[PDB]
């Protein structure tokens, strides 16, 4: 009944690529030198649960390390996931049209430093003034950087925090998985 | 190493069919209440490990319910089962072409009954005289029965066993997976 309709969901993989797919949404992974998530295009976030019959390697996972998260029709698989990388309850999810893509926000970079922030909700690579933050950080994410490019700019990935400006000044998801 | 050669594996789900493919082995579920096994077609058998990654549905399962053994490149997979029936590891392995296929054996017919005896070697449905087998039984499989055509004509699942014939009279599979 949580789940959603399997009558349009479509999955394949063929030798090292593969696609959840569905009316909404495009969720291609790729093996180098494991399975990970490589893109998504995500065209009308929904609620449903992504059943499990339609979804490849289901076993073994741990819901937290889902990039996609369950509760808004994440698949439960091994290819929605990517090292250093935990569910992104906070992700810019109010976007109606939203990609997922591992590359640095444009005139951005993003440092992997013990010193940095936790992990909080998503901020956006530019102020409210529309000025762009070159410094980011993440304490033991991977490169290239979890990013979200959504119609109001580039968003990053809840473990990348802003490396020396205040939190304060920048433009943040209020949404939560 | 012990697993199948993912770069050949062509796995898919479209609404309520799916199939698990390489070079040799073309597997076909489909829901139909629940998902389960419709029929595959193996043009030469293998003994490696077919991964889990190219796999839909693939936790919660008992090994014992996959009906392709896992020993000979079944999918760990809940689309590798079917109700009523466990794994064939003595199915007719031998043969080159092979066809799993849910319906009697041309001329026979197959009855559900606790009386039968319990499941054994696959059996053909005719003897080495050539002569057909009428009538066969399983204790608590589901119909349509679970047969493989093959080249020297039409076996029966591990289940299936001849009603009033004395099963010695019967060519055996002498393949254990």
Known sequence: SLECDPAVIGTAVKGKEAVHSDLGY?????????????????????????????????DGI????????????????????????????????????????????????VHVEETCGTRGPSLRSTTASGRVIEEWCCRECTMPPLSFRAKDGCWYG?????????????VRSMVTA
Do not use: V
């Open 26 to 58: 495009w969720i291609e992974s790729e093996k180098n030198d494991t399975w990970r998530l490589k893109r998504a295009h995500l065209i009308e976030m929904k609620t449903c649960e992504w059943p499990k019959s339609h979804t490849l390697w289901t």
């Open 62 to 109: 741990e819901e937290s390390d889902l990039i996609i998260p369950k509760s808004l029709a994440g698949p439960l698989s091994h290819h929605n996931t990517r090292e250093g990388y935990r569910t992104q309850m906070k992700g810019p999810w109010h976007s109606e049209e939203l990609e997922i893509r591992f590359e640095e926000c444009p005139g951005t970079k």
């Open 158 to 170: 809840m473990e990348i925090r802003p490396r020396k400006e205040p939190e304060s000044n920048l």
